[PDB]
Paper text:
The two structures exhibit no significant difference, except for the replacement of the Ser144 side chain, which caused little structural perturbation. The E166V mutation abolishes a hydrogen bond from Glu166 to the pyrrolidone moiety of bofutrelvir, as expected for the replacement of Glu by non-polar Val, but the positioning of the pyrrolidine ring is minimally affected. The Glu/Val166 main chain forms bidentate hydrogen bonds with the indole-carboxamide group of bofutrelvir in both conformations. Regardless, the indole-down conformation appears to relieve a close contact between the Cγ1 methyl group of Val166 and the indole nitrogen atom. The Mpro loop centered on Thr190 concomitantly moves up toward bofutrelvir by ~1.5 Å in the mutant structures. These rearrangements allow bofutrelvir to form more intimate van der Waals contacts with the main chain atoms of Thr190 and Ala191 and the Gln189 side chain, making it fit better in the mutant Mpro active site.
The main/3C-like protease (Mpro/3CLpro) of severe acute respiratory syndrome coronavirus 2 (SARS-CoV-2) is responsible for making 11 out of 14 cleavage events for liberating and activating the viral non-structural proteins essential for the virus replication, and accordingly, it is an important target for antiviral drugs (1–4). Multiple studies have identified an Mpro mutation (E166V) that confers strong resistance to clinically relevant inhibitors, including nirmatrelvir, but the underlying mechanism is not fully understood.
Author numbering:
A (entry chain A), B (entry chain A): 1 to 301
């Protein structure tokens, strides 16, 4: 009954959020075991934002130049090290609330939950998708950096995103938990175009499937199409080209709903070529593509 | 930077979710101090769903007929009591993770976060609004009952909703934490019309304000209107009539944005009378009314 954007319970990740101060810069860090991960641009003072030599800047910082607080507790930093665009502060105490976790680099088009924090304390949680251009359409203010994106499976938390900066278009760029930026972005104060924002076609089809599951069926047609046929009438609308894997990924949904995959593409083709006509699908007046096929199966169990 | 539906961190509420079994019925309960709150329709067997005499049904249940589990821990039920449509099982142990909390009955149009659970374990979290007709547009399946809605302020958790049933239209009805249903709904298996779904006009205006804050300004006009004038050209579209309080509530936003409240109404009037014209506002193709003015100020700090 019903369907909306649902983030994972943020409890397993709150117990890992801490405050990190390095000069005038304050932001958030992730405390797992006896290490604290944070964006390396903490060490950057104001006049080091255009082109900062992080090696040179880090050579001037010592362990005591990094103050970490897990609430009122102050963790002693006993060893720092820069890994890609991320810093690894080794604290003397291990987080007793460290959950079963693993660092993973999500693929473009996969969803994850974000826990926007400020000054170490969590502020809110919301679902995000790794756009095809490698940006995320998040909600971040100053001090938001260090906030992580994650997926929760069973008892294992898969961290996949740490916020770093915003782009000139309002969307955001970040890094995986190993320090490598998603996309071609770099942690320098310079204008960085994000690239054309494509639409995750597989997710859209996945979203139409929960529609039919929930009783929204006005978009279903007596039509069908071919895979190549659909991609030609979908590239005009900047849609990710549908592959055979995408078809297979939608297999479980197609098999459950009794609606063939290519029949959905035919229903999607008519939506791109004719619009919504003021109708609505799962409460939305546009085509949603931040619901991955796997997100649908779990919410529509 | 950016703006989307953001729920409160669900950590303070996960430590209070437990499993409740009474016969073939299994659902979720809220464990605060030495009491567990759950919907009274646990005691209802299948053939007691049309018109159940809860007094009669509860007279046949004993303390041992209620099994409560907080994960692998089994809490002993030492005293049960029905309060309105909610049961209060007194367990022998107090929840060590009980947060500072209070039970509150939210007003129609206020938002709250929901933590949909199943078999006692949390599944996800999402933002909801108490619709004017007293329903909520949630996402619930079988076994979802007992899931709570809450707002988090500082360290205090204000529980305001416990899910009970779905309506014939896909929307959901529930109770406050004192057992009283929101709206005229009752916990019986019978068709219950929800009433016309009005639009929280104050929230819509609030949502347009974050728009202008975030750089979406195409909807702003050289026009203005009068309070009575706007309400007449808004009742046709089933919009909550704007009051002077609503105006005052939007004062902080209006004063910050340099846009008078009635000027926003004029911009809203043209949107209702002319549509979106394919444009978009904060990523939405329709007018959003589940962002309360207070939700905007905290997300746009
Ligand atoms: C983290 O704390 C913030 C998050 C930002 C604030 C507004 N919304 C966000 O997503 N990150 C920043 O402010 C970075 C900090 C820089 C420090 C030096 C190294 C590079 C990152 N800056 C930006 O996000 C930034 C700079 C900039 C310049 C020109 C266009 C866009 C732009 N974004
Ligand atoms: C809680 O576990 C579920 C939540 C439902 C399941 C589907 N989505 C939901 O929101 N609650 C129910 O299934 C209730 C249980 C009844 C037990 C006996 C007392 C009344 C509640 N039933 C309904 O939600 C229900 C019955 C019904 C009959 C006719 C139209 C709608 C309708 N909804």
């Amino acid at each position: 009954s019903g369907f909306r954007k649902m983030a994972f319970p943020s409890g397993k990740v709150e117990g890992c959020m801490v405050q990190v101060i390095c000069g005038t810069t304050t932001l958030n860090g992730l405390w797992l075991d006896d290490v604290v991960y944070c964006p390396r641009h903490v060490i950057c003072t104001s006049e080091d934002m255009f082109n900062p030599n992080y090696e040179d800047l880090l050579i001037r910082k010592s362990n005591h130049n990094f103050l970490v607080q897990a609430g009122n507790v102050q963790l002693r930093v006993i060893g720092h090290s820069m890994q890609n665009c991320v810093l690894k502060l080794k604290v003397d105490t291990a987080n007793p609330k460290t959950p079963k976790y693993k660092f993973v680099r999500i693929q473009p088009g996969q969803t994850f939950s974000v826990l926007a924090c400020y000054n170490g304390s969590p502020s809110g949680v919301y679902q995000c998708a790794m756009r095809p251009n490698f940006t995320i359409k998040g909600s971040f203010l100053n001090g938001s950096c260090g906030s992580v994106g994650f997926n929760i499976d069973y008892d294992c938390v898969s961290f996949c995103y740490m916020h770093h900066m915003v782009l000139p278009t309002g969307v955001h760029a970040g890094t995986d938990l190993e320090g490598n930026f998603y996309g071609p972005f770099v942690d320098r104060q310079t204008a960085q175009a994000a690239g054309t924002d494509t639409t995750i076609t597989v997710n859209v089809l996945a979203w139409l499937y929960a529609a039919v599951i929930n009783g929204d069926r006005w978009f279903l047609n007596r039509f069908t199409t071919t895979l190549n046929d659909f991609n030609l009438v979908a590239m005009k609308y900047n849609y990710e080209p549908l592959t055979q894997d995408h078809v297979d990924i939608l297999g479980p949904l197609s098999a459950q709903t009794g609606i063939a995959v290519l029949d959905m593409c035919a229903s999607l083709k008519e939506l791109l070529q004719n619009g919504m006509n003021g109708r609505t699908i799962l409460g939305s007046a546009l085509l949603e593509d931040e619901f991955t096929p796997f997100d649908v199966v779990r919410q529509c169990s």
